[model samples]
Target: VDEQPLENYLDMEYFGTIGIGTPAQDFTVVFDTGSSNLWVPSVYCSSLACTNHNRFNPEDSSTYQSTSETVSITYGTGSMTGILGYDTVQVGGISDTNQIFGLSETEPGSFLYYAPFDGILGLAYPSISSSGATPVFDNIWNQGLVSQDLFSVYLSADDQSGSVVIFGGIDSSYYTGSLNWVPVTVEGYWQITVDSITMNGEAIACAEGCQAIVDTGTSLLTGPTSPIANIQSDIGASENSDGDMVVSCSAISSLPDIVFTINGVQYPVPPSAYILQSEGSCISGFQGMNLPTESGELWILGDVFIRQYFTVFDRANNQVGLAPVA
Candidate 1:
């Protein structure tokens, strides 16, 4: 029964607080599904990013043990270098002993310095772990902390903030229908193959079936450049100086929904979910990212899509479950 309240950061990222060590020292972390490596700033770090964020002190924790293993993790935006350690980690009132994690000694100054969270908890598979350490969820399962080796995420709308992450079980109250299961196409990420992506009942993105990664750490939906451009053009959105597509807020409701067909099931993202309103204008939640993989070009369905559907990361069955939210 590990349930954590997610705090939305400028509608771009969502994170939750968790406790580490035997005495329960708290730290805020982003529950990222795209990567695997749990790391927090260490007290030994002298960088500006570490100075601004919460630093984990090994001396303060009675159960902390150093492993002498060094690790470096790279992300699309930045990277971090750290040393490995083991401690008791508690989330949602459920605690796991000897949970392996990293204490970062060098973090990119501009990358995480301004972020609200202290670190990131990778929710993806252990195969992608940089330090070869068992992920927190895997530790939870191995220690029988939860009945099921699964977790669910619920991202809320920008106007309001009540997102949550349920570990080991799914909350039926958050979603409204039966869970639609999809086999994971790749083991490294929570990657699944989409049947097709359509606009107004016609094929658009992923017409020939493409791979998609359900990444909570990512803020926007990203696809191949050509397809994203077509969708942007269809919605009458133009690229701004910042590379994000902007459209008239007045036309948001008039835009058609983008439908993603997965395992013969149709999931539609309404105009409200596609148009991100801020200040006096609205920006498209979908963006063009040319991320190519062995399977093919990959589309990343981030918070924009997750907010519209409750997502279940089922490790026991190696499948992903999607359900609509009320």
Candidate 2:
């Protein structure tokens, strides 16, 4: 298997290391499906986000080529601005030469500073890329470095260790039973349609059908404000001063599973997976995200849902596969 070990960062983010340039400088980056640009802090970066993170020195690599093109990427949390360049990138057993990427010189906001990862390697479609740069996965598929044009992810719980992301192949050991495949509703962001969301086997939101985007980058499950608030109320959770839903730590064992039905397959997220405990307080993993776009009301299934099911992104067949973990 063309597998790469993924490090979990406080159960908030998952990241992997990739070698860049001729001699290969290692940089830790989060594989994000919400966006479509690969970027790392450069030696020219002077932002606080780059202070303690690894930086890429273009001068140190003989194979590095500067496109002299400037680009900026905006995210739900923060934004990064940098110059475009091409270099050799290697991850797992796959290596692509002249892979276009961003060298961030400025990143403003506390979002980047709070994260442990050095940068982000987006896995979304190239249609959303600002510079029209080829994503690492696309390069691997185009170059025929992998046996299949797909990748699978296995994210462990917070208390557990040893998460993994395998590109080019699937590891049957990561999941149980057969995989349930669903066609992607949209080609952009691994988007899929949700049949319904149920709590305690009772239908709640999305009972009439709705869209959802599976994002590895997001830490919590986000959706429209009203629906999430209703869920919090049903679970007997109260909103804290920070606008987060809080529940009693002792009540966790009594809580029911939050199930999301996709393409007739039901994937249930247990209470332990949706409850966040910190400083003697238990917070619900569900959050409100009124995304300012056409699909603003769509559901975003983040790490909370992924940790329960081993996910497969099959670009070759334009489908997504999910199976319960062992």
Candidate 3:
């Protein structure tokens, strides 16, 4: 039971079964913190990748239970549909009872086709409550059960920060600095509108309508086509033939600080972060270059953003804080 950093998390897939008494089924699940809906690709899905994830079948387990609520979840990556149900969800002693989750019966397309996951467990505080109240995280935290209801995760994906998810308390060994607290602007999503972005001590263009979404679901950094291109150009880096940004990993020590200004506050990103040291050689992972203009219209600051701070998901007051490791 040793503690690990959240930035070190991996993105992959796993399994969970929900329901009660004679109707339970196992589901393949992806652990996601940015969302609050839990659902899986049912056995009746129509996509090829959907077949790779575990499908829920109520006829198998004797402890399955179903609810009367119909549920749907859509994402920038894909969508899922199913009936909402309550059941026991267990993983490494981190178990919750009567957990509100989804049992999807159909699937559209998934961004994680090659990934081995089946469904998703939205760790995000529920946006809308049953009585039309606050988020689930707030409800739980207010009830004093939130901290004990912590969840642990292992994101096993390529080019992702590997780490763990502790529901309530933070393990002090994550970062090497003082954690700076940023106030949240939006209520539903764990979103904060970024004021500005900087690469190597140079400020990128931020017009009147430009903003950024700090998402943990995605692995890479994305921005508006123009700003993204401009930032990359400033770094003197270029995208490879594969369209991924590339830079000199050895130059990490000399790399300029990538700063993000949010709500009048500045968060600094160091060169060691942009530098990818996989094997023995150092590589510039923060090419900060080109983005799929047609595919993405929003700037997605993923793990690259989380690597610089110790993030806290606070549902009680509807806030998230990023503090440096003590």
Candidate 4:
């Protein structure tokens, strides 16, 4: 859609991308529904990670303001290290007075450096802020700026170019139809207990007590290895390619509704969601991607899953919900 609309809080609003240098590339970013600190990358890091978007340079921007708190974050794949400061983080005509931000002096990998986004505009709840400190979302929420109750995201990553993390209200523009809102059974993690995930019409059996964490932070869709493998086999998803597993790009598109069994109910994914590309498509490896052999980690309904549904991440209420865009 446009960008994420403001939530009930002043601090949490839709954070969109600011196109940087030459032709721009797309990156996936959410108004983090978890942590409060805002961060992207520093322009000065002479590494592949800094190549993707405009790196933050305090010296370059005359309005840059530094904070006393220093922050560092380590993800499963990589990490970002920078000093906490205040800056003008803007999107869709809205701006803040002095929001806490990050300018990375260093990062561990090429993706952070090369990704199209400048940084993350954390839109999580205010509880996680530095002990009564004003988090970005809190700053927005406290001011009564955005909308209320919930915020949503719609993302679909191309294999090569990267997926899009849309903010501010879900794009009502692409309504193939209506919205089915799933209730959030758990908070902290973007988790909903998935009773099962069906391949075609038949409900694929999973291990006992199968629950999935619908995380936007992760790239791969993971679950119990046995069940994950079974779904692939049922769909004839192949493993001949590299990294985790690989099915033909065309193969995934043909998949039946990926019905997620939740709290005694079944939620189906429309066929449009399975459209994936591999090596040649867009960049993020969505095409020809596969389930990992090693499983039991939290299952992330990444861009792959979100593309199929009109999803909502309600951090304030601590739940994740989704519905088929009817």
Which of the two, 1 or 4, has more TM-score?
1
Deviation in Å, model 4, residue 95 alpha carbon? 1.3
Index of the highest-lDDT prediction = 1
Query: What is the per-residue lDDT of model 3 for residues 57-138, given as tens digits with 9 covering 90 to 100?
Result: 6566555566677776667667666676555454323344555556666666646576555666565655522222233344
Candidate 3, overall lDDT?
0.54
**Which portions of model 4 show Cα errors greater than 4 Å?**
1-37, 43-48, 60-63, 122-135, 156-173, 176-178, 200-209, 217-220, 241-244, 248-255, 263-265, 270-272, 279-297
Can you write out model 4's per-residue Cα lDDT over 1-326, one digit (the tens) per residue?
23533221111122355422112223234455435556766665655677665565666565666676667766545677777766655543345446666667677776555444456655554544433335554565455555654566655333322223343345565446555555655443455666666666566755344545565544445555665666666655655545434555555446576676666656665444443444453112122223332233345565456545666765456656566543
RMSD of each: 1.2, 1.3, 5.6, 7.0
Clashing pairs for model 2 are none
Residue-level lDDT tens digits of model 1 in 1-76 = 6788888887798888888886878899999999888888899788889988888999999999999899899898
What's the residue-level lDDT of 126 in candidate 3?
Answer: 57
Candidate 2 residue-pair clash tally:
0
lDDT of 1: 0.89
Give the C-alpha miss distance for residue 280 in model 4, angstroms. Answer: 7.3
TM-score of each: 0.97, 0.97, 0.72, 0.71
Q: After superposition, how far is residue 57 of candidate 2 from its true place, in Å?
A: 0.6
What TM-score quantifies how close candidate 2 is to the native fold?
A: 0.97
